[PDB]
Write an enzyme that holds these catalytic residues in place. Structure first.
Site, PDB file in Angstrom:
ATOM      1  N   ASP A 194      -7.427   6.519   1.657  1.00  0.00           N
ATOM      2  CA  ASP A 194      -7.081   7.535   2.642  1.00  0.00           C
ATOM      3  C   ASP A 194      -7.563   8.905   2.178  1.00  0.00           C
ATOM      4  OD1 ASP A 194      -4.759   9.047   1.348  1.00  0.00           O
ATOM      5  OD2 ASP A 194      -3.890   7.058   1.333  1.00  0.00           O
ATOM      6  N   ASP A 220       0.537  13.016  15.386  1.00  0.00           N
ATOM      7  CA  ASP A 220       0.964  13.161  14.005  1.00  0.00           C
ATOM      8  C   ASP A 220      -0.217  12.951  13.053  1.00  0.00           C
ATOM      9  OD1 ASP A 220       2.796  13.717  11.989  1.00  0.00           O
ATOM     10  OD2 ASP A 220       3.451  11.623  11.843  1.00  0.00           O
ATOM     11  N   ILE A 262       0.827  -1.200   0.000  1.00  0.00           N
ATOM     12  CA  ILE A 262       0.000   0.000   0.000  1.00  0.00           C
ATOM     13  C   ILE A 262       0.864   1.253   0.000  1.00  0.00           C
ATOM     14  CG2 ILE A 262      -1.853   1.256   1.144  1.00  0.00           C
ATOM     15  CD1 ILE A 262      -2.554  -1.501   2.486  1.00  0.00           C
ATOM     16  N   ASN A 317      -3.149   9.674   7.401  1.00  0.00           N
ATOM     17  CA  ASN A 317      -3.512   8.946   8.610  1.00  0.00           C
ATOM     18  C   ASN A 317      -5.016   8.959   8.862  1.00  0.00           C
ATOM     19  OD1 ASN A 317      -1.139   7.928   9.354  1.00  0.00           O
ATOM     20  ND2 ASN A 317      -0.470   9.545  10.708  1.00  0.00           N
ATOM     21  N   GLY A 350       7.634   2.358   8.690  1.00  0.00           N
ATOM     22  CA  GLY A 350       7.788   1.148   7.920  1.00  0.00           C
ATOM     23  C   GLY A 350       6.901   1.100   6.707  1.00  0.00           C
ATOM     24  N   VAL A 409       3.573  -0.630   4.639  1.00  0.00           N
ATOM     25  CA  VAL A 409       2.252  -1.213   4.830  1.00  0.00           C
ATOM     26  C   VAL A 409       1.921  -2.102   3.645  1.00  0.00           C
ATOM     27  CG1 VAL A 409      -0.159  -0.766   5.316  1.00  0.00           C
ATOM     28  CG2 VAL A 409       1.591   0.816   6.123  1.00  0.00           C
ATOM     29  N   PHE A 467      -8.365  -3.121   7.609  1.00  0.00           N
ATOM     30  CA  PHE A 467      -8.084  -2.536   6.294  1.00  0.00           C
ATOM     31  C   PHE A 467      -9.229  -1.622   5.859  1.00  0.00           C
ATOM     32  CE2 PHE A 467      -6.346  -2.244   2.006  1.00  0.00           C
ATOM     33  CZ  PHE A 467      -7.484  -2.113   1.192  1.00  0.00           C
ATOM     34  N   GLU A 509       4.605   3.372   2.058  1.00  0.00           N
ATOM     35  CA  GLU A 509       5.729   3.445   2.976  1.00  0.00           C
ATOM     36  C   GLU A 509       5.610   4.739   3.757  1.00  0.00           C
ATOM     37  OE1 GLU A 509       9.349   2.808   0.918  1.00  0.00           O
ATOM     38  OE2 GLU A 509       8.407   1.672  -0.711  1.00  0.00           O
TER      39      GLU A 509
HETATM   40  N1  LIG Z   1      -5.134   0.208   7.887  1.00  0.00           N
HETATM   41  C1  LIG Z   1      -4.850   0.663   6.666  1.00  0.00           C
HETATM   42  N2  LIG Z   1      -5.683   0.344   5.641  1.00  0.00           N
HETATM   43  C2  LIG Z   1      -5.415   0.829   4.426  1.00  0.00           C
HETATM   44  N3  LIG Z   1      -4.403   1.615   4.042  1.00  0.00           N
HETATM   45  C3  LIG Z   1      -3.604   1.917   5.072  1.00  0.00           C
HETATM   46  C4  LIG Z   1      -3.747   1.492   6.382  1.00  0.00           C
HETATM   47  N4  LIG Z   1      -2.735   2.007   7.181  1.00  0.00           N
HETATM   48  C5  LIG Z   1      -2.005   2.704   6.347  1.00  0.00           C
HETATM   49  N5  LIG Z   1      -2.463   2.684   5.055  1.00  0.00           N
HETATM   50  C6  LIG Z   1      -1.916   3.446   3.937  1.00  0.00           C
HETATM   51  O1  LIG Z   1      -0.659   2.923   3.565  1.00  0.00           O
HETATM   52  C7  LIG Z   1       0.228   4.003   3.191  1.00  0.00           C
HETATM   53  C8  LIG Z   1       1.470   3.942   4.043  1.00  0.00           C
HETATM   54  O2  LIG Z   1       1.061   4.283   5.383  1.00  0.00           O
HETATM   55  P1  LIG Z   1       2.111   4.698   6.479  1.00  0.00           P
HETATM   56  O3  LIG Z   1       1.457   4.765   7.829  1.00  0.00           O
HETATM   57  O4  LIG Z   1       3.308   3.837   6.544  1.00  0.00           O
HETATM   58  O5  LIG Z   1       2.460   6.171   6.037  1.00  0.00           O
HETATM   59  P2  LIG Z   1       1.865   7.614   6.322  1.00  0.00           P
HETATM   60  O6  LIG Z   1       0.502   7.510   6.843  1.00  0.00           O
HETATM   61  O7  LIG Z   1       2.054   8.453   5.038  1.00  0.00           O
HETATM   62  O8  LIG Z   1       2.842   8.124   7.431  1.00  0.00           O
HETATM   63  P3  LIG Z   1       3.236   7.797   8.945  1.00  0.00           P
HETATM   64  O9  LIG Z   1       4.241   6.649   8.837  1.00  0.00           O
HETATM   65  O10 LIG Z   1       3.761   9.021   9.615  1.00  0.00           O
HETATM   66  O11 LIG Z   1       1.914   7.283   9.588  1.00  0.00           O
HETATM   67  C9  LIG Z   1      -0.570   5.299   3.347  1.00  0.00           C
HETATM   68  O12 LIG Z   1      -1.165   5.740   2.134  1.00  0.00           O
HETATM   69  C10 LIG Z   1      -1.665   4.902   4.335  1.00  0.00           C
HETATM   70  O13 LIG Z   1      -2.825   5.717   4.213  1.00  0.00           O
HETATM   71 MG   LIG Z   2       0.225   6.392   8.659  1.00  0.00          MG
END
Ligand SMILES: Nc1ncnc2c1ncn2[C@@H]1O[C@H](COP(=O)(O)OP(=O)(O)OP(=O)(O)O)[C@@H](O)[C@H]1O
Ligand SMILES: [Mg+2]
EC number: 2.7.11.22
Length: 288
Positions: free
Chosen positions: A76, A117, A9, A122, A15, A17, A72, A11
């Site tokens: 976003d 954050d 999905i 998010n 980490g 996702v 899931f 980074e």
């Molecule tokens: N539970 C989830 N279901 C679907 N997509 C998700 C879920 N959690 C994260 N994602 C998506 O996966 C991508 C990577 O998320 P990730 O949390 O690693 O990064 P971020 O939200 O941009 O930053 P941060 O690491 O500061 O939270 C983003 O587009 C996020 O919206």
């Molecule tokens: Mg995130």
């Protein structure tokens, strides 16, 4: 392993996702691979359940790697906002989303859990008109590094001014500030304070809301990173800042962007603002 990787999905700060299927349940989940005090505090978040908080299903600690298994959701708010930019998100949906996110924060804050954050990536949405806070409580447990896991730049756009000024003991108010920024961006279709450095972030806030002083923020000139040499900009009108928005909306936004975190509106009080007198729950049109 136990999961079938469907896709990557994204980074982020900590980490990567993955969308994954539980081979035993058939459950489709989001799997975050990260890279201790942190273990217990993450594991505690498994109890922090609310319809507007992405559910943390399981925490797995193995071979010095940490995995978080999450509910899931299919999109976003950043993607939805980009997808809606020609027309804008309709105000009843903006209002529904803001209302739900305030309910989520009110729940978390009443249990003494900060997000710290908040940002559009998010905030996750489904076809039924729900919106959910993601990655709640992760920052307290891992800190917030200056660069992300894969090299990417940390977004400052939603950071509250007391954090930028070096306050060590910031409060639930920081989440209200972030949500205010997101509210404004949903209305205007551009980020309110798109800083590209910590000082640019601070000065962008100052050029819109005025440089804070002891009249509006008692204690500000004693904050760790406050400098007397900060330029002194006058405050702008909110009718100029988020133009289209009506006076109820501008009133609420002004209370969520108060400089003094002690006077900034709480989530619980925000839910009672007249802006929400006609709140409804529309469904978005999502193309998945
Ligand atoms: N539970 C989830 N279901 C679907 N997509 C998700 C879920 N959690 C994260 N994602 C998506 O996966 C991508 C990577 O998320 P990730 O949390 O690693 O990064 P971020 O939200 O941009 O930053 P941060 O690491 O500061 O939270 C983003 O587009 C996020 O919206
Ligand atoms: Mg995130």
């Amino acid at each position: 392993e136990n999961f079938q990787k469907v896709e990557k999905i994204g980074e982020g700060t900590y980490g990567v996702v993955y969308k994954a299927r539980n081979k035993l349940t058939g459950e489709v989940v989001a799997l975050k691979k990260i890279r201790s005090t942190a273990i217990r505090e993450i594991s505690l978040l498994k109890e922090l359940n609310h319809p507007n908080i992405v559910k943390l299903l399981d925490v797995i600690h193995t071979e010095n790697k940490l995995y978080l298994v999450f509910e899931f959701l299919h999109q976003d708010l950043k993607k939805f906002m980009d997808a809606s930019a020609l027309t804008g998100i309709p105000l009843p949906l903006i209002k529904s989303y803001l209302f739900q996110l305030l309910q989520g924060l009110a729940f978390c804050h009443s249990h003494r859990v900060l997000h710290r954050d908040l940002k559009p990536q998010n905030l996750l949405i489904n076809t039924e008109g729900a919106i959910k806070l993601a990655d709640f409580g992760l920052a307290r447990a891992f800190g917030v590094p200056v660069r992300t896991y894969t090299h990417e730049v940390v977004t400052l756009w939603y950071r509250a001014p007391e954090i930028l000024l070096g306050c060590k003991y910031y409060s639930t108010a920081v989440d209200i500030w972030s949500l205010g920024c997101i509210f404004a961006e949903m209305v205007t279709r551009r980020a309110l304070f798109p800083g590209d450095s910590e000082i640019d972030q601070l000065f962008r806030i100052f050029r819109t809301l005025g440089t804070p002083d002891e009249v509006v923020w008692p204690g500000v000139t004693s904050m760790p990173d406050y400098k007397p040499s900060f330029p002194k900009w006058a405050r702008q009108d909110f009718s100029k800042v988020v133009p289209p928005l009506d006076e109820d909306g501008r009133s609420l936004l002004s209370q969520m962007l108060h400089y003094d975190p002690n006077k900034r509106i709480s989530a619980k009080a925000a839910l009672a603002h007249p802006f929400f007198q006609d709140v409804t729950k529309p469904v978005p049109h999502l193309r998945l």
